[PDB]
């Protein structure tokens, strides 16, 4: 409950500002003129918001909710920029790892379960072919990916443990999350109850607050890129499209259903497309299907710029309100991109039940803890045809991936 927003003030108002803003806001919800849409509680909310901000000792302890976060992030930025400036390189070698099965393949390259012969531990290893990456004009996205992932550190982001290259491949070794992708469960359980969705969505919300404070845009929020760990919590993978963006940026990339309008249109965009995608994720989670689909992507982009979302009937009224505000086609009105930034999502009626402190601390009861079968289980994961990895006797594209 943010007293500063309830009084429509900024964290640095003066002592007269809170007294007049209290009198300006108490009349706009007075129990005699605007005692209509149940706003007698918005009036009490204003009444309690003055009593705390008027008291310089009550205000000081309240100002320690923001300041704790402001500091938490400051140190996280500093820890990020030290790693950004000196990105780890060649921190392992292929022949340290026993290649087990394949865990997934696709538009990136190949992700296999591996085993470090010595520490006898379990990792995911993503193999990218240098020649195919330069083929897919994805050299700058691949270099980014390793650089943003080795430098970030957050409970809900997968952790890159090692990285290295040989003559024709780029190798990336990260923590092994065994519970499988949220996609496979969301399509087996059919959909998610609104509290279940609220669980995952809050982690995405804290993770986007972290990433955006680092000036990062993630640009691939999708249930196929979220994993569930043994505590039922969320681990994000695929940083193939993540960019460090202090201003605007222009690449149309992502996944058609999840693209914000401004990505599809030729105007630049900001972090705010990550909040749009979050609206798609909460919608697909709570309904079973994404808000905009079609067999041809251009028809998906027609729906996306229409600014028309049909909501399902079992969609709560508070969810319908949060979604109307995340799927706003005008990024100058979209939630997350307004004056109070992410706090508009956090202090929203659909998120009144949720403890952002406790969600961070991994304390909450995860409404679904997947099936555990020991150390190397690939049961929560589809099977794939195995290829053998050839290693050319000539270095390929040594110039393009110097930085890797």
């Amino acid at each position: 409950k943010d007293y500063y927003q309830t009084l429509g003030l900024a964290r640095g108002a003066s002592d007269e500002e809170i007294k007049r803003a209290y009198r300006r806001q108490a009349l706009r919800y007075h129990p005699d003129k605007n005692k209509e849409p149940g706003a007698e509680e918005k009036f009490k909310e204003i009444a309690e918001a003055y009593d705390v901000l008027s008291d310089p000792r009550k205000r000081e302890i309240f100002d320690r909710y923001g300041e704790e976060v402001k500091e938490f992030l400051a140190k996280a930025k500093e820890d990020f920029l030290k790693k950004w400036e000196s990105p780890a390189q060649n921190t392992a070698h292929l022949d340290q790892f026993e290649r087990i099965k394949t865990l997934g393949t696709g538009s990136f390259g190949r992700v296999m379960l591996v085993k470090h012969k010595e520490t006898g531990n379990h990792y995911a290893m993503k193999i990218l072919d240098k020649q195919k990456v330069v083929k897919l004009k994805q050299i700058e996205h691949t270099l980014n990916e390793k650089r943003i992932l080795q430098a970030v550190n957050f409970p809900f982001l997968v952790k890159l443990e090692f990285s290295f290259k040989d003559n024709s491949n780029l190798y990336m070794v990260m923590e092994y999350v065994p519970g499988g992708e949220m996609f496979s469960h969301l399509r087996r359980i059919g959909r998610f109850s609104e509290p279940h969705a609220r669980f995952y969505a809050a982690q995405i919300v804290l993770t986007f607050e972290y990433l955006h404070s680092l000036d990062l845009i993630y640009r691939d929020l999708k249930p196929e890129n979220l994993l569930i760990d043994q505590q039922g919590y969320i681990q994000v993978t695929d940083f193939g499209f993540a960019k460090r963006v202090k201003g605007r940026t222009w690449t149309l990339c992502g996944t058609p259903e999840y693209l914000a309008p401004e990505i599809i249109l030729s105007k630049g965009y900001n972090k705010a497309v990550d909040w749009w995608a979050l609206g798609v994720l909460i919608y697909e989670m709570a309904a079973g299907y994404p808000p905009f689909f079609a067999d041809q992507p251009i028809q998906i982009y027609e729906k996306i710029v229409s600014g028309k979302v049909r909501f399902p009937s079992h969609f709560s009224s508070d969810l319908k309100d949060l979604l109307r505000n995340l799927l706003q086609v005008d990024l100058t009105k979209r939630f997350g991109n307004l004056k109070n930034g992410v706090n508009d999502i956090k202090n929203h009626k659909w998120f009144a039940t949720t403890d952002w402190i406790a969600i961070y601390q991994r304390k909450v009861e995860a409404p679904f803890i997947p099936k555990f079968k020991g150390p190397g289980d690939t049961s929560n994961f589809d099977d794939y045809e195995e290829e053998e990895i050839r290693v050319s006797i000539n270095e390929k594209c040594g110039k393009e991936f110097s930085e890797f």
Partner: peptide, 20 residues
């Protein structure tokens, strides 16, 4: 119905990304 349309649109599988 929408659900029947979602099974229709061939997009109930893993969605590959676009690099455009």
């Amino acid at each position: 119905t929408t659900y029947a349309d979602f099974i229709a649109s061939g997009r109930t599988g893993r969605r590959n990304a676009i690099h455009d």
